Design an enzyme around this catalytic site. Structure first.
Site, short mmCIF file in Angstrom:
data_model
loop_
_atom_site.label_atom_id
_atom_site.label_comp_id
_atom_site.label_asym_id
_atom_site.label_seq_id
_atom_site.Cartn_x
_atom_site.Cartn_y
_atom_site.Cartn_z
N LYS A 1 12.79 18.44 -65.07
CA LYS A 1 13.35 17.75 -63.88
C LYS A 1 12.13 17.96 -63.01
O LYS A 1 11.83 19.38 -62.49
CB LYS A 1 14.73 18.22 -63.40
CG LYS A 1 15.03 17.38 -62.09
CD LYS A 1 16.41 17.81 -61.96
CE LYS A 1 17.01 18.13 -60.78
NZ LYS A 1 17.61 17.17 -59.58
N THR B 1 13.80 15.25 -57.09
CA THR B 1 15.43 15.24 -56.70
C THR B 1 15.66 14.03 -55.65
O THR B 1 14.77 13.87 -54.90
CB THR B 1 15.68 16.50 -56.15
OG1 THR B 1 17.24 16.82 -56.12
CG2 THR B 1 15.08 16.94 -55.09
N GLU C 1 14.39 12.88 -63.27
CA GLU C 1 15.52 13.84 -62.87
C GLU C 1 16.26 14.42 -64.38
O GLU C 1 17.23 14.86 -64.26
CB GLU C 1 16.88 12.92 -62.34
CG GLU C 1 16.58 12.58 -60.82
CD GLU C 1 17.40 13.81 -60.05
OE1 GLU C 1 17.77 14.75 -60.78
OE2 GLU C 1 17.73 13.87 -58.79
N1 CTN Z 1 19.75 15.30 -56.96
C1 CTN Z 1 20.63 16.09 -56.47
C2 CTN Z 1 21.34 15.99 -55.22
C3 CTN Z 1 22.18 16.85 -54.96
N2 CTN Z 1 22.17 18.05 -55.64
C4 CTN Z 1 23.05 19.39 -55.10
O1 CTN Z 1 24.17 18.80 -54.57
C5 CTN Z 1 24.20 19.41 -53.39
C6 CTN Z 1 24.75 18.77 -52.24
O2 CTN Z 1 24.21 17.40 -52.18
C7 CTN Z 1 22.80 19.90 -53.00
O3 CTN Z 1 22.74 21.05 -52.03
C8 CTN Z 1 22.11 20.33 -54.43
O4 CTN Z 1 22.71 21.59 -54.60
C9 CTN Z 1 21.40 18.28 -56.84
O5 CTN Z 1 21.42 19.23 -57.44
N3 CTN Z 1 20.60 17.27 -56.99
#
Ligand code: CTN
Ligand code: MG
Length: 102
Positions: free
Chosen positions: A20, A23, A73
């Site tokens: 990954k 994000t 991702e």
């Molecule tokens: N693409 C993403 C989006 C969010 N998140 C996790 O979800 C929490 C709240 O959005 C974020 O604070 C994060 O922990 C994630 O792991 N990956």
């Protein structure tokens, strides 16, 4: 030293292994930018697990998310849209953070 950002802990291993590398976040995390060095914790317990360097950022929308975003991702595109539908219900404007674990 507090954490700047968190991920669900089910992503921890994918991050450490380099599977990954991006994000996808909402406006709440649109302030991270290329060159940032960030301490990363697990969402569930705030436990630190790595420090990342942000290498690129961009904006994206629900209807412009791509197969390649999903691949970065470590998901299928269907899986990514499902996750976004739960994490950011009703939202369409997102922010891509590309990073490497230091
Ligand atoms: N693409 C993403 C989006 C969010 N998140 C996790 O979800 C929490 C709240 O959005 C974020 O604070 C994060 O922990 C994630 O792991 N990956
Ligand atoms: Mg779901």
């Amino acid at each position: 030293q507090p954490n700047d950002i968190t991920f669900f802990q089910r992503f921890q291993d994918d991050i450490l292994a380099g599977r990954k590398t991006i994000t996808i976040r909402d406006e709440s995390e649109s302030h991270f930018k290329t060159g940032d060095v960030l301490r990363v914790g697990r969402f569930e317990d705030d436990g630190y697990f790595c420090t990342i360097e942000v290498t690129a950022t961009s904006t994206v929308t629900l209807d412009t998310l791509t197969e390649k975003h999903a691949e970065q991702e470590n998901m299928t595109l269907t899986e990514l849209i499902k996750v976004i539908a739960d994490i950011y219900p009703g939202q369409t404007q997102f922010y891509v953070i590309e990073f490497k674990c230091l």
